[PDB]
Design a protein around this ligand. Structure first.
Ligand SMILES: [Hg+2]
Ligand SMILES: [Hg+2]
Length: 85
């Protein structure tokens, strides 16, 4: 009986997403330090991508609300909204 090892990758149906945060600068949060905070808390790249918006290179839509409010308590529950897709 032969003696061999094979490795391969097989796509899943689950998509890779990107997480977009808009409105931080309206609470007079600085988008640059917001970007770097997100980068480090999530261990994942991020960039300011609009004039008030930051894009994080993963799906963090579960935590992202609580994380935002922990770090910036100004942001009350009636002013941060999870859109969807
Ligand atoms: Hg936006
Ligand atoms: Hg990542």
């Amino acid at each position: 009986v032969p003696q061999k090892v094979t490795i391969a990758k097989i796509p899943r149906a689950k998509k890779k997403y990107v997480t977009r945060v808009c409105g931080l600068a309206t609470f007079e949060i600085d988008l640059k330090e917001a970007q770097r905070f997100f980068a480090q808390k999530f261990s994942c790249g991020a960039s300011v991508t609009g004039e008030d918006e930051i894009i994080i290179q993963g799906d963090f839509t579960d935590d992202i609300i609580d994380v935002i409010q922990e770090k910036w308590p100004e942001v009350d529950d009636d002013s941060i909204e999870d859109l969807g897709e």
